[PDB]
Design a protein around this nucleic acid. Structure first.
Ligand SMILES: C[C@H](CCC(=O)NCCC[N+](C)(C)C[C@H](O)CS(=O)(=O)O)[C@H]1CC[C@H]2[C@@H]3[C@H](O)C[C@@H]4C[C@H](O)CC[C@]4(C)[C@H]3C[C@H](O)[C@]12C
Ligand SMILES: C[C@H](CCC(=O)NCCC[N+](C)(C)C[C@H](O)CS(=O)(=O)O)[C@H]1CC[C@H]2[C@@H]3[C@H](O)C[C@@H]4C[C@H](O)CC[C@]4(C)[C@H]3C[C@H](O)[C@]12C
Ligand SMILES: [Mg+2]
Lengths: 502, 1339, 51, 50
RNA sequence: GCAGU
């Protein structure tokens, strides 16, 4: 009886006919596989599909792309009822056969039944509430869902094989919550901090950064424009480059104290690209919001300013327009990473030779007993870290300003248009912590226990790492990978405990 | 040069001259299993050792014995392919010759009465195919090698993990191969404790008292005695000087001379030097010097017979004055010098309750079997069977070797059981380590960790079976019928066969083979796994066993490891890595004798790798051998440093010594991050083979080794000339130099055509050679899947451009042009078997029939009259493949359809349509149909048709191979006959059957004619012997599962084209999902109008620093740039001199490259064939860590008239205007990975629900339903989505009355729910009430 | 396949259940039969409902 | 702690659902407890509106 | 068990 109620609670568990312990009554209801957690708090669910996600950058913020062959199964009783209702089927058996044969009329019915019907898209692990958002489906012909780019950061979703589940809200209350509470246009701020989470990202930020920069002697510099439309005309006609410093007549509106928009027209010292980008900025925002090279944070501040000043309905339009224009002018950019983009500073070899000479003198000071191996080790580490910082500073000083170009004959240095630097400086992808490993040196690596090896990787990834340097780097690479693979099961357990306390 | 590798020569940019060729990559599996099954005369390995481990089996009394003469392996009943078709294990029967020796009742020495020897059969053992795989129940399985802890003794510690006091607690652990663990440890107060099988701890001296040591013997073993020969002067004390090392002397030492050190001082080693140089050995100490000293001997009073002082008792002044009355001159005392020597054993003996052998044995018994009353001969048999019985404990040969090597003994060989001195030496080394005189072992050192492979695990399981048989034979030889039985009446084959069967089929290490491409197989066979029986568990393995130890260098790849929960537990054997005779990974090194790096190679294991200084493979050296630099970078003890040229002992044998065969295929591995290299090495093994294999324009040179060492290709066994080439077979006329006497001299190679892999891909061999061309030994004759002219081709060389394109490559997406779908580049064939099993239900048999009820007549158009589909039939989803019906009854239809039957009259049928249909979305061709019919069931017309087809094919193939072989034999006869006594114009008229009896004059060649005629006659006999066996295997019944009548297997062949969603990748960790298939006119294009095949993202390079994917691109631009020149010279039909000149310029290019391709020796036809194979880009070889420098890539770009920066100006396809910056355009080698969106997409509205809980079923095979788990419920609770949540809980999963109402409301146009209680909650209330608990619902 | 999170128990479906398409078919057949018997004389329509 | 406070709620359905089902259910049984379905988990368990 | 995110 005690093995029936709780097997293994008193002494040896009874094991039958597979040499595996029998599952008792208490084991049915407890644990991660018990009723309480596996069947009652979460459960398998009808009307639910799943597929790979792809970009679909043509979408609006409230739209997803839903495969026709997924939406024809997810909405089967809706199509059966609309075939019965519209007279196209005399029965539910006739409508079932019509959907099964996939006639040309069930696709018109399917276009009818999904029209204003949201679906919830979910990427597990659902770490926070923005891991489930509603979207209106746009029927596409693929087999992969087309997830809007701006919401990817909310889902923590890249398109490298991620799958997402689609759920259909059936009732009018469920549809109205998908539309009012969970729709992705309602979700543009984060609930953890009040900052935007529907926010532009790597390609978008790089497009808007490349458009809003300035070059010194660019084509079409110095002219005076009647506004943003003439700037777009000049750029598309190829009569002026996107970076030509120019004078544009800008009309900007500010919300007065009474609450309406009062205008002001002034000649702004601008570039052609910021003039072009001004065409998508809604009215109550100032010109100082685009008259700068727009990195990731400047774009996020643009969106936050628009949300506070104008509200949600102008902000979703602004976010979609920002995404379209960033994608467009990153495509026109031809921004490409070659191997010459990773310029190694020509001072790297002599800085490394100086540090090698210095560690040789600390080694002869150790051989002559002046210093103990502890202080010798520490001094070699510090005169390798000083050399690493020297190499990184020389690399970044070479990489950020290598553009020296001619204004009326006089050479003049400007911020570099290098692609690796344009990606890092945008905040599109990467930081100087990776540019330093591409074009600098990648420095002191640690042992598996944490004690850093006294001789560093004096190479970078543009040059090769030899067999020993590569093995030494794998030491820390696999440690990071194992901590990543073993701390998700700890952060999820902390989140579970916090949810069940609060 | 070669003949298969001068068709197309891969230009090598490698610079270090290779000294050791890559070994046979599957020698781990094959060598291990060969050691298992092969005959061993000395009885060390495999089956012979397992038999001698158990046999001879003596009876309980000794009247009879069962001994073992020899064993044999039978012939397998079915071939590998017949076992894959009939779904049976490919095994061989184990025929063991046993001998029952029976004596008379009372014999002087066991003089025998009779001997009865016969060949018993015990089990079948699965054989390993010649590629390292096992065919087990038809599926090919790979037994993955295991990295487990070597048996021995390991000293370790916890570094203040206990008592919060920073006291490191040491522990020794004896791990046997088979047996019981034995632990010693220190507690926070330095009492030595013992554990057995990790149960609660005893004092460690209890096991010393279980052995017959008394207390004074224990103190004699673990101590050294200080002796007080108490002379006239108070406690005259004998002394050796070094005992005075490092203590605070509060007493002065005076002995015929100086007072050496004043009282109240600490003394130094120079004072000991003083005391030993003035030669004082006998001193005068104060009276209280004995207060605290522990006696060593049991001091007894011979006057009264009473022991006046027991051993291990602290002597005091009152006790000293007590025993001084007895007239005792010498007082022995345990010498305990703190911080050099320990009281540990004495203070341990102060804790244990036992004082003799029986009390200690009783305490060990109460520890081991608690609650069972111990008797003397029960406890003293339990302890003797724990560690000291050779059938219940084994410290095996590797265990004894590691055991003696730890304790620094001289012998490497010994007994498998423990001894007194083994346990004493383990305790002694633990005490030494506590005293700072040693260091604890590193548990994940690869010299403390060893490889247990298929042939050792299988022998272990076979020995488990043999002991399960030995117990039964001992239970049988204790009976009185011993004069009538034979030894096969005693052996049940089912224990042995069940042990071996469960190991090979259902173990954790016997894994379903990953058969995607050749690389997947060849790296699943070289797999090492810390998991498994006797290993770790992935949930309880810490961060430290998952790390890259410094000893994996050359033995285990640091890169190639999984990414999920088991990372660093599944390892991949590196390229040159080998195993010891004990199972310790060893790696090859070139000896450096005097600075001349000798080409002599020595395989060093991990323990002997640290004694030496080992130079890098990247260390420069001249043709002489000396290191041209003077401070060589080397590895001395596990750390890396610079050494002089004279110190260096060994050198690495190659630069790919450190990485596995999967990571050695990544070009420019030295420029990728190790994370991205891990991802690329893991994603190469997932690429599916495309229609036409395309070599890599940038490769590493390991392609040929991987493609040849995997058995996917057809490699010529003997050189020759291709007599006949055909898509289904290659017939090679062997050279005269390579054929034996009395042999046809013809090798036939039958090619695998369109068969199913384990992963439902197509494996298909295409002949590579042409008719009449010469082949050599080792030349690839026919390709395999993912193989191009004998190289490993896992993908296609797509022309990529690195630029952002309108957001369609956002966040690792891939833009693909329509000319990749047009040219069928990543179209892959996938073969699926689908089984229709006509069973015997209890209502009657299900029948395979074509008259299916209530189905259209057009649906049965593709079925033949027997109910099965035609071969070649193009089927789409839903189509009937095998028409089947199950008999049903007890209809009991509702009154409304009863009236419906009454009106229209269509009477329902007694059968139900249970036919096999194509799954939805699947569309392909039926390429094979197999019908397995149970013996006794009459075969339908289709089964008899398939059988006549099989018999015609078997007879035709056997007759055709006989015609081929007999034609070769007659050609050889004709060649011998014209070597002397030539009838060449007479023999052409004489028919071929008359040449045998043509007597030639016998100089010597009449012996050749004898042997060739005998060969022909036995060929004719073997043809019939094979044909009758093929006929009886075809027409015989099938051993199906009980209950099933017949099985029809339909093999669909689907062609999956590339489409948005399909996961594509490169070799550098740059995965991505195709996001659009773009038209050709929408792609960017160069000044010549060539559009770009694939547009990748530049933003995926700089943060995840896989720079290799850039260089591979820049070099793939160069390679193809060479080809686009040769192709041009092949279009103007240039003279072969200009082609020879340009190809020699392309092969000479590079900075002191190791290869020399001299086209001066190529004939003009060979130059033309080479240039025709190079017109699609010249294949380049960039070996790992000595590959092509960027300067050489720029020089190759200059040679092909390309921009040396690797970047051209592109134009937009849609608007025709130039992209503002130069774009990196080149040729990246892309791979289509097996994560296809066809197999991912799934949706359900409703369907089948689960049985106990009424929730939907699991996955897309059971029609799915997505788990709306716990975190998603928190997501809907964080919004105020109370109704969405409620309908996810009630009317979509569990509300049984509510989900049908929901369906009928959605259909009737009313989107409203009526939720009730979820049925899982009713299951929960019924399961809580089945405990004694009353849970209710109140109201 | 040694997969602990799955078992044999959650691949076994409940075959005795009725498909909600068949429940909708039954209720639709009830409605259709009720109308096409409402298109008759009450006497004979009740004879059919009664028989 | 968050565990010792999750397990000490006045609602035995939430606490038994969280972890240590056996201890919570025996304490609730011998205490003759009552759970009024006031939080969110007890209304998700029984399929109600939260 | 093995992979994917
Ligand atoms: C003859 C050979 C070299 C001498 C010795 C040294 C290492 C020994 C093996 C290991 O001990 C592992 C294993 C232990 C089992 O108990 C019996 C089988 C195994 C394979 C042993 C067989 C044999 O004894 C070996 C190969
Ligand atoms: C060229 C070669 C040696 C001369 C002759 C001698 C034996 C001939 C084969 C056999 O006849 C079997 C078979 C018969 C089919 O009909 C056609 C194919 C086969 C393979 C033949 C091919 C070819 O004709 C062979 C190889
Ligand atoms: Mg992803």
């Amino acid at each position: 009886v005690d093995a029936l109620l709780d097997n293994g609670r008193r002494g040896r568990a009874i094991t039958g006919s597979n040499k595996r312990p029998l599952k008792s009554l208490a084991d049915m209801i407890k644990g991660k596989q018990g009723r309480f957690r596996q069947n009652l708090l979460g459960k398998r669910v009808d009307y639910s599909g799943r597929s790979v996600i792809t970009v679909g950058p043509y979408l609006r913020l409230h739209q997803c792309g839903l495969p026709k062959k997924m939406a024809l199964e997810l909405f089967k009783p809706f199509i059966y009822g609309k075939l019965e209702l519209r007279g196209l089927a005399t029965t539910i058996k006739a409508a079932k056969k019509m959907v099964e044969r996939e006639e040309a009329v069930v696709w018109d019915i399917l276009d009818e039944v999904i029209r204003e019907h949201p679906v919830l898209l979910n990427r597990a692990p659902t770490l926070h509430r923005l891991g489930i958002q509603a979207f209106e489906p746009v029927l596409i012909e693929g087999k992969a869902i087309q997830l809007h780019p701006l919401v990817c950061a909310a889902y923590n979703a890249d398109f490298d094989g991620d799958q997402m589940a689609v759920h259909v809200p059936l009732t009018l209350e469920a549809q109205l919550e998908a539309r009012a509470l969970m729709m992705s246009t309602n979700n543009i701020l984060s609930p953890a901090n009040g900052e935007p989470i529907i926010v532009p990202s790597q390609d978008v930020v790089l497009g808007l950064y490349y458009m809003t920069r300035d070059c010194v002697n660019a084509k079409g510099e110095g002219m005076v424009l009647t506004g943003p439309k003439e700037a777009e005309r000049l750029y598309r006609s190829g009569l002026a480059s996107l970076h030509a410093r120019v004078k544009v007549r800008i009309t900007e509106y500010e919300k007065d104290a009474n609450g309406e928009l009062v205008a002001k027209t002034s000649l702004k010292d601008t570039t052609v690209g910021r003039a072009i980008l001004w065409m998508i900025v809604p009215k109550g925002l100032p010109y100082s919001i685009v008259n700068q090279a727009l990195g990731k944070k400047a774009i996020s501040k643009m969106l936050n300013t628009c949300y506070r000043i104008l509200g949600l309905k102008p902000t979703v339009i602004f976010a979609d327009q920002i995404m379209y224009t960033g994608f467009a002018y990153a495509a026109r950019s031809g921004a490409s990473v070659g191997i010459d983009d990773m310029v190694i500073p020509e001072k790297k070899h002599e800085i490394i030779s100086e540090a090698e000479a210095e560690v040789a003198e600390i080694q002869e000071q150790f051989q002559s007993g002046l210093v103990t191996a502890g202080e010798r080790y520490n001094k070699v580490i510090d005169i390798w870290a000083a050399a690493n910082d020297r190499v990184s500073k020389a690399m970044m000083d070479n990489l950020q300003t290598e553009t020296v170009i001619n204004r009326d004959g006089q050479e003049e240095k400007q911020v570099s248009f290098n692609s690796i630097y344009m990606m890092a400086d945008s905040g599109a992808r990467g930081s100087a912590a990776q540019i330093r490993q591409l074009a600098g040196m990648r420095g002191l690596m640690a042992k598996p226990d944490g004690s850093i090896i006294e001789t560093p990787i004096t190479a970078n990834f543009r040059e090769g790492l030899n067999v020993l340097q590569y093995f030494i780097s794998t030491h820390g690479a696999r440690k990071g990978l194992a901590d990543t693979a073993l701390k998700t099961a700890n952060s999820g357990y902390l989140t579970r405990r916090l949810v069940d306390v609060a | 040069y070669s003949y298969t590798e001068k068709k197309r020569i891969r230009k090598d940019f490698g610079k270090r001259p290779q000294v050791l060729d890559v070994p046979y990559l599957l020698s781990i599996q094959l060598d291990s299993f060969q050691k298992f099954i092969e005959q061993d005369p000395e009885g060390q390995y495999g089956l012979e050792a397992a038999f001698r481990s158990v046999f001879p089996i003596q009876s309980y009394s000794g009247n009879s014995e069962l001994q073992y003469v020899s064993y044999r392996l039978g012939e397998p009943v079915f071939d590998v392919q017949e076992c894959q078709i009939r779904g049976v294990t490919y095994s061989a029967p184990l025929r063991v010759k046993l001998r029952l020796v029976i004596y008379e009742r009372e014999a002087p020495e066991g003089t025998v009465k009779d001997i009865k020897e016969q060949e018993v059969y015990m089990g079948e053992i699965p054989l390993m195919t010649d590629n390292g795989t096992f065919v087990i129940n038809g599926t090919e399985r790979v037994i993955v090698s295991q990295l487990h802890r070597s048996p021995g003794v390991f000293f370790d510690s916890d570094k203040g993990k206990t008592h919060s006091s920073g006291k490191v607690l040491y522990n020794a652990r004896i791990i046997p191969y088979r047996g019981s663990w034995l632990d010693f440890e220190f507690d926070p107060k330095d009492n030595l404790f013992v554990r057995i099988d990790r149960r609660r701890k005893l004092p460690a001296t209890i096991i010393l008292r279980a052995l017959n040591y008394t207390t004074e013997q224990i103190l004699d073993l673990f101590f050294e005695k200080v002796i007080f020969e108490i002379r006239d002067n108070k406690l005259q004390m004998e002394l050796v000087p070094e005992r005075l090392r490092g203590e605070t002397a509060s007493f002065d030492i005076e002995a015929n001379g100086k007072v050496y050190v004043e009282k109240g001082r600490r003394i130094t080693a120079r004072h000991i030097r003083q005391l030993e140089k003035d030669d004082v050995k006998l001193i005068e100490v104060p009276v209280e010097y004995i207060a605290g000293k522990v006696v060593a001997k049991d001091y007894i009073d011979e006057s009264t017979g009473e022991l006046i002082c027991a051993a291990n008792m602290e002597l005091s002044l009152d006790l000293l004055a007590k025993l001084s009355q007895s007239g005792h001159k010498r007082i022995e005392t345990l010498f305990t010098n703190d911080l050099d020597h320990g009281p540990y054993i004495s203070e341990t003996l102060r804790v244990d309750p036992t004082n003799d052998r029986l009390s200690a044995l009783v305490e060990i018994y109460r520890m081991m079997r608690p609650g069972e009353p111990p008797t003397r001969e029960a406890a003293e048999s339990l302890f003797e069977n724990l560690f000291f019985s050779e059938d219940r404990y084994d410290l095996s040969a590797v265990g004894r070797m590691k055991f003696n090597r730890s304790l620094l003994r001289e012998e490497i060989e010994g007994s498998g059981i423990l001894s007194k001195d083994d346990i004493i030496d383990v305790m002694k080394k633990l005490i030494d380590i506590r005293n700072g005189k040693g260091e604890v072992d590193d548990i994940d050192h690869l010299g403390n960790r060893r490889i247990r492979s298929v042939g050792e695990m299988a022998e272990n399981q076979f020995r488990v079976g043999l002991v399960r048989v030995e117990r039964a034979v001992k239970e049988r030889l204790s009976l009185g019928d011993l004069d009538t039985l034979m030894p096969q009446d005693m052996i049940n084959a089912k224990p042995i066969s069940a042990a071996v069967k469960e190991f090979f089929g259902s173990s954790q290490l016997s894994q379903f083979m990953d058969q995607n491409n050749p690389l997947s197989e060849i790296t699943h066979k070289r797999r090492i796994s810390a998991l498994g029986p006797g290993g770790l568990t992935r949930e309880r393995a810490g961060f430290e066993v998952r790390d890259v130890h410094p000893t994996h260098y050359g033995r285990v790849c640091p890169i190639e490891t999984p990414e999920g929960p088991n990372i660093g537990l599944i390892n991949s054997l590196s390229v040159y890595a080998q195993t010891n005779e004990y199972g310790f990974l060893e790696t090859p090194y070139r000896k450096v004798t005097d600075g001349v790096v000798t080409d002599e190679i020595h395989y060093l294991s991990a323990i002997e790798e640290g004694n030496y200084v080992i130079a890098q493979a990247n260390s420069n050296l001249d043709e002489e051998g000396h290191f041209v630099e003077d401070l060589v970078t080397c590895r001395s003890k596990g750390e890396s440093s610079l050494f002089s040229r004279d110190q260096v002992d060994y050198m690495d044998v190659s630069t790919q010594q450190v990485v596995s065969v999967g990571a050695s295929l990544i070009p420019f591995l030295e420029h990728d991050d190790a994370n991205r290299a891990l991802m690329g090495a893991n994603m190469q093994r997932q690429a599916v083979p495309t229609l036409r294999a395309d070599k890599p324009l940038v490769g590493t040179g390991m392609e040929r080794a991987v493609a040849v060492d995997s058995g996917v290709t057809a490699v010529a066994k003997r050189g020759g000339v291709v007599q006949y080439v055909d898509a289904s077979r290659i017939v090679i006329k062997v050279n005269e130099d390579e054929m034996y006497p009395g042999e046809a001299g013809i090798d036939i190679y039958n090619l695998t055509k369109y068969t199913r892999s384990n992963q439902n891909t197509c494996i298909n061999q295409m002949p590579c050679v042409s008719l009449g061309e010469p082949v050599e030994r080792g030349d690839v004759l026919a390709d395999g899947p993912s193989t191009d002219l004998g190289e490993l081709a896992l993908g296609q060389n797509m022309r990529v451009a690195f630029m952002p394109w309108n957001g369609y490559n956002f966040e690792d997406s891939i833009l693909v042009s329509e000319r990749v779908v047009q040219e069928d580049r990543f179209t892959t064939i996938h073969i699926q078997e689908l089984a229709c099993v006509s069973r015997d239900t209890k209502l009657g048999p299900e029948e395979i029939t074509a008259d299916i009820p209530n189905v259209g007549e057009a649906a049965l158009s593709k079925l033949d009259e027997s109910g099965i589909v035609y071969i070649g039939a193009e089927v789409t989803g839903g189509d009937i493949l095998v028409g089947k019906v199950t008999p049903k009854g007890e209809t009991q239809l509702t009154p409304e359809e009863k009236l419906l039957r009454a009106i229209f009259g269509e009477k329902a049928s007694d059968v139900k349509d249970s036919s096999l249909r194509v799954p939805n979305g699947v569309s392909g061709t039926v390429i094979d149909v197999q019908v397995f019919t149970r013996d006794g069931v009459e075969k339908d017309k289709r089964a008899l048709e398939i059988e006549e087809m099989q018999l015609k094919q078997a007879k035709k193939d056997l007759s055709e191979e006989l015609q081929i072989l007999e034609a070769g034999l007659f050609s050889r006869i004709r060649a011998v006959l014209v070597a002397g006594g030539v009838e060449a114009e007479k023999l052409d008229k004489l028919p071929r059957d008359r040449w045998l009896e043509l007597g030639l004059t016998d100089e010597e060649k009449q012996n050749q004619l004898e042997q060739l005629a005998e060969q022909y006659d036995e060929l004719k006999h073997e043809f019939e012997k094979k044909l009758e066996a093929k006929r009886r295997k075809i027409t015989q019944g099938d051993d199906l599962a009980p209950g099933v009548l017949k099985i029809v297997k339909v093999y669909l062949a689907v062609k999956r084209r590339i489409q948005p969603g399909d996961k594509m990748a490169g070799r550098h960790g740059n995965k991505g999902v195709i996001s659009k298939i773009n038209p050709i006119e929408d792609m960017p294009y160069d000044e010549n109008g060539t559009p770009v095949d694939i547009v990748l993202n530049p933003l995926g390079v700089p943060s995840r620093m896989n720079i290799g994917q850039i260089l591979e691109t820049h070099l793939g631009m160069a390679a193809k740039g060479i080809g686009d020149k040769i192709n041009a010279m092949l279009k103007q039909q240039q003279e072969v001199a200009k082609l020879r000149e340009f190809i020699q310029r392309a092969y000479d290019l590079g900075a002191d490259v190791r290869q020399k391709v001299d086209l001066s020796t190529f004939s003009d036809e060979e130059v033309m064939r080479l240039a025709e194979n190079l017109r699609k880009g010249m294949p380049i070889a960039t070996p790992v860590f000595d590959g092509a420098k960027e300067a050489e890539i720029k020089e190759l770009l200059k040679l092909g008239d390309l921009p040396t920066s690797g970047q051209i100006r592109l134009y937009d396809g849609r608007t025709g205007e130039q992209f503002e910056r130069p774009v990196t355009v080149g040729y990246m080698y892309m791979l289509k990975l097996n994560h296809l969106v066809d197999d991912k997409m799934h949706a359900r509205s409703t369907g089948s629900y689960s049985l106990v809980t009424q929730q939907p079923l699991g996955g897309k095979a059971q029609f799915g339903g997505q788990r709306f788990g716990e975190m998603e419920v928190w997501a809907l609770e964080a919004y105020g989505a109370a109704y969405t949540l409620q309908e996810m809980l009630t009317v979509k999963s569990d509300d049984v009355n509510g989900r049908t109402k929901m369906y009928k409301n959605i259909v009737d146009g009313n989107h409203q729910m009526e939720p009730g209680m979820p049925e899982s909650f009713n299951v929960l209330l019924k399961e809580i009430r089945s405990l004694g608990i009353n849970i209710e619902l109140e109201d | 396949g040694d997969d602990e999170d799955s078992h044999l128990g959650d691949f076994i479906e409940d075959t005795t259940l009725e498909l909600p398409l068949d429940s909708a078919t039954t209720e639709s057949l009830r409605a259709a039969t009720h109308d096409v018997l409402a298109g008759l004389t009450a006497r004979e329509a009740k004879v059919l409902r009664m028989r | 702690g968050i565990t010792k406070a999750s397990l000490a709620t006045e609602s035995f359905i939430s606490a038994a659902s969280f972890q240590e089902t056996t201890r919570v259910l025996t304490e609730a049984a011998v205490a003759g407890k009552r759970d009024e379905l006031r939080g969110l988990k007890e209304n998700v368990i029984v399929g109600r509106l939260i």
